[PDB]
Design a protein around this ligand. Structure first.
Ligand SMILES: Oc1ccccc1-c1ccno1
Ligand SMILES: Oc1ccccc1-c1ccno1
Ligand SMILES: Oc1ccccc1-c1ccno1
Lengths: 291, 291, 291, 291, 291, 291
């Protein structure tokens, strides 16, 4: 990287100015998962990029998943699953495992990776200071809406408390668990939690890290890849996409329709992906605006 | 409780005034463990008392243990122990289990019990916002100081950040884990962590919940129980007491010598023990002052 | 009080939590008079209870009367009265005596009793910093509304200035005297002044200390005593009650209709009456809500 | 006043600039008494001048006396005096009269005169918010220091609380009464109280209103009048001056030696005397500096 | 000035109180030009009066012209003029000269005259911190609206930023130059700029310094001079007045119709004119109210 | 710039993190002159880089020169020079020209270039709000220290006021002119002014833009170029360097000895030079530390 003339190193920095302006003082919610969370070089770059935003006056909020890690701990504990449709039923036993894996294992790794750059990361759930609540969600198996345990969606967000925390210069690492109105803790899907935090906080952008290049209209036509698209078009397309892509697209529609200016689906296997997506017009992701 | 004349209900309240004065606006560090943490009625009373302090203008900080719960999870994970002396060696595998049990299981229960009274409890470790660090500790087996893994003592405390958090009206539930100066996370003994937080924050009192009536000089002489004692006397007695009582007495000496006005050893099996100890001259505990 | 087991001393404290919650950070206006002001043990308890509220994060405001003490000073000064109906006419001579007795004698005793617990009590009238104004009031003698001098009702309250004073941690002891819109000072009935301050400040409760057990519907039927009642019912009953009880009932209706959540009539001859009424379900008083 | 050319009205205003500069944002303690307090035109001018300072960004504090008015009320109450030397003995009966006359009569008139210009004046004693304390003083009769009751000198001043009050834009009208360290209220000589408040608050000037032209070295030599003098000279002269002038000169020495830049003795029978003394080089008073 | 009795020096000061009240904490915009800017004694008095307002808690803002000085510098630079109607065309060359003369010569003299009294004056244009913008203006020559270069009127004012600057205790000396919406700097007529700043800031008064006694209805009838007049009357008269008086009258109408309580035309050849106009009923100027 | 893989665009951004950390929240004083000020592309890049720092949470302060532009305006005004040694004598006539050229021409261009990115730049001299003072300086011609008019060096800096201005988010563009202790304005050499502002404000870095590659020990030996050097070494070398380089080297020694961590001499003819020097290890400049 040092055999490259310094006069174009400069032009790469200078070309970040327009996006430093539009994001200075704003909130960016980043959903974090996939290979970016499982590979160690990608992990360290993600943490470094969170430090970058924070030392630019941008306000990142990180919402993380960790579905496979829950599964692995349940197998190690010999906890037998129940499966309606293709969904595991979240018993009280499964929730305590979900909670301790997400908040006491996965969030801790991220907190410590970011905190190698300074006192920034703080781990939280909806349980802490009552930052958000959950409402229990049913799921449609074949054609019947059916119960699958203590699983929910974000109900209300303590917008005020959350923005205080970010104004103190802290990067909130969020594990998606929250009490319902009776104090019983549910597990929320991280993709939807991210979209609801973005809307609640008036984020400028929602970033969805994914193990893909971007949205393909008719996969696997290599040139069905789009780089921008609006909600109306996207919504009519959602019933056709692979099961993997649905949660990320639903999050982007809920967010952008909820008034977040743009949601982005970017390639988590690219080192420093959020740097390229935010401060560079070379991003391979796909941007969602309203229309 | 309703067959008791109201004119002495009044005198019990009125008799709390002198201690409401001395504690208004001060910090009280409470170490939490034992039956008070394992019995459900005692648990709910402890949470309610934390809410009490907070709605009186007092600033509680809770430091919690959970040694037996770590042991149970290691047995469920089939993780074989190594034991030097009578100490388990904390490998990197054992630490991750310690961390997820303490912060993702034990702290969560307390957070949610306190949060039934309002947005007060927040869960933290030394990892979060760099609130404190650990320095690795050796242990003396027979007569040789020996390594027993990633176990340490509190090195530095971010006093400033911690008192900001308590001034925002938050009750910090602390899990005793912290990075060393190289970012490697150790497990700290909860009794000593409590004493170091008390000293760092200029707490007015340190409360040590214990499954005993109080300090017995020559157990089990029933009338060797003391209700007050100073550090010089206590120190000369420490080499004689049962192995259970040493950690709590060492915490009280480090705290009170460090300038905390009084440390108290109180009976955690008594419902609402911190209420009786703080707002009543009928406490059965034992108070430690300097001399 | 020390021959009573400590395990129920605890339950009395613990049972104060629900009311500590509802009152934390709120304003409580207390009208003060009767035997609670003339007996020295009751006086000291009242002062101690004001200190209690203030060291709990509650914001008391004290409005006091002192009609008999004015009368005694007029007799000592040999000032002859004029009486229309059964009302003394407040000449400029009588007002100066009222003013100096209320503010320079009665308020001073209360200020000093409260200030034995700390720097809390401050004495004020409507004259000071223009905290409130009076509008002259006529009175109906037999059937003719007639003038009886410089006597009035509270016209406007400097809500902003008053809540600044209480936010600085000060307990305002209020003597009910205020200038009209021309700067001429009137004497306001303490019961009505209390109700208007409660409404102006958005108090959570109005407490009216009285030398009775509570409201009796058809005195002296011992079991016509009510413990709760709403405004509509109470209003239809006001024309039947003894002359003593009318001022306190009118204050409660004006207050609760003005949006104060509850007004209470409590027994001032009970030591620590405001403690029992606020932090105990054993209060003998009577509560007024709207309906 | 309207038959005077406007071009010299201007020069009188313009000539106030140097003293507006030196006093902007500073504290001026004014002792108030004599004819300036007994004549109604002088009273109204004094109040108007307090409003002037406050609408210039200057911070006045008024300390007032009222010895003759106490005497008149004692005669009206038929309270027989005791006199050691030429001093009335302040019994508990005399103190309550002193207190109610000073705070409930004399201070009220001043509060209301100033408050015709806006929400500025607030009445206070040392009793209120614990603003200052008194220590009992003995007096030397002939040659024996003798007790003369509950009379004292200012012991400690709550400097912090007092300057908060003045920073909120309030003019403190101070009645000189304060509790000793046991809570018993004494009456303090207003001249000395003024000097101790000036020193405690770091006032820029102390103004002592007096019924004289200024300090005469050898009264009644008409040209023994001085307009400036330092403490060392003044101190050596104090044993020679009429009994009336001693209290005001002692106040000026205690103040200026205590580090108040200048104390002034000015003619209270001159309408708007503090205006001429502060914003005009034509003052007839006498200035005291240290040397 | 010292052969004049001190008892009427006092009455001149005292008579300023009503206007010190109405202006305390308010903004006064003063347009500055004419002999008051060219004579050195008048200049020093104007600066001293700005210091006066600032040490009274009043908030002056100074808008200055300097048309003749621009003309002189253009002649010294040998820059040939173009004149449509009787208007110089402001080329890019003329604007740079206007800008450097107004901001680097004329404003500097005023800044330094005021700053002899303390750290108050700060020089600004619309270019600085984007305090205001200009929109290009056409002019009507004979009957055809024609271009005369980079000359404009104030478009938008950064009200928020401007009032921050004045709240920090700074006297803004404003040179009337501002960018249009494309960043090209125009020269704004100082009279109209003053009126637009007054309206934008919610000034209490607009002062227009002028080389006349005041408004004459039918000049030169000596007794056609008015001392007060409303907008409706004034507007119907504007088409009749000498060319010199039109800009100042248009500013007063735009200001007062825009809700500034009064605009004043005062005699800049009178030493300390703003002192006489603000704190004296002897002003020779003319006051404009709405009607 | 778009034919370059995005995976190394990322690495250039990521490599800025260490310097974003060290500079976040710090002050950087930049001396601005030479071709960077005379070429329009370099000018626009410099302005854009000031916007960059400000949208990263860094606090730039710009000190500018303009010697040749003063000379050109004096020739256009036909003002004959006097020259002692090789120095122009700054008469009162020359100073007014210096002042209006620097503050009303040169500073304005920079203010407007930066303000195309937002409300950041504000133009100031020592005259404004008394931000700094000058002390007159003599110069040594041959061997005799001789007067050369109103030329000086920075005497005192209003550190407090200056850091308030930068904390409000403003980029101070400083023209080097200041009053002496008598209010007479001098012209200060921009290089030395920059060094004194850096020291007064506790800047983290001083940047000196220069038309050279860096410091050459024995020019023109191409490989006598150094990239780092300490004060002791540099000082012993100063008597040997070309006349052009002396002012910049003296500024770096005064600054770094005054406790500024590093001063840098960088190539102003390189587009975006401050970006390469601050966020890139490829800078061609030379760094000065203390030793
Ligand atoms: O959990 C925290 C850790 C450090 C600092 C603040 C917090 C926090 C989380 C929610 N409110 O405050
Ligand atoms: O009267 C007072 C005494 C002490 C502190 C504040 C006050 C006060 C009363 C009204 N505004 O301020
Ligand atoms: O230009 C200034 C000089 C000193 C202090 C403040 C300012 C200023 C002008 C606009 N915003 O801030």
């Amino acid at each position: 990287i040092e055999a490259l003339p310094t006069h174009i190193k400069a032009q790469v920095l200078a070309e970040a100015l327009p996006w430093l302006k539009q994001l200075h003082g704003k909130v960016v919610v980043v959903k974090y998962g996939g290979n970016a969370m499982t590979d160690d070089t990608l992990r360290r770059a993600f943490a470094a990029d969170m430090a970058f935003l924070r030392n630019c006056g941008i306000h990142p909020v990180v919402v993380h998943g960790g579905g496979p890690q829950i599964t692995a701990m349940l197998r190690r504990l010999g906890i037998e699953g129940d499966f309606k449709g293709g969904f595991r039923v979240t018993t009280p036993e499964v929730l305590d495992v979900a909670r301790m894996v997400l908040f006491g294992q996965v969030g801790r790794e991220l907190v410590n990776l970011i905190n190698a750059h300074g006192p920034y990361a703080v781990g939280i759930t909806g349980e802490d200071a009552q930052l958000f609540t959950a409402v229990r969600r049913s799921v449609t198996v074949d054609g019947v809406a059916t119960d699958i345990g203590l699983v929910g969606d974000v109900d209300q967000v303590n917008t005020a408390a959350m923005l205080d925390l970010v104004a103190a210069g802290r990067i909130p690492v969020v594990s998606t668990l929250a009490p319902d109105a009776d104090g019983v803790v549910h597990n929320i899907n991280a993709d939807t939690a991210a979209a609801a935090v973005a809307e609640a906080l008036g984020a400028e952008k929602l970033l969805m890290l994914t193990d893909i290049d971007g949205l393909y209209t008719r996969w696997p036509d290599r040139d069905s890849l789009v780089s921008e698209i609006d909600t109306g078009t996207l919504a009519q397309l959602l019933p056709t996409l692979e099961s993997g892509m649905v949660p990320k697209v639903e999050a982007c529609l809920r967010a952008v329709i909820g008034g977040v200016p743009s949601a982005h689906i970017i390639d988590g296997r690219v080192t420093h992906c959020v740097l390229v997506e935010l401060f560079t017009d070379a991003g391979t992701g796909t941007k969602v605006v309203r229309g």
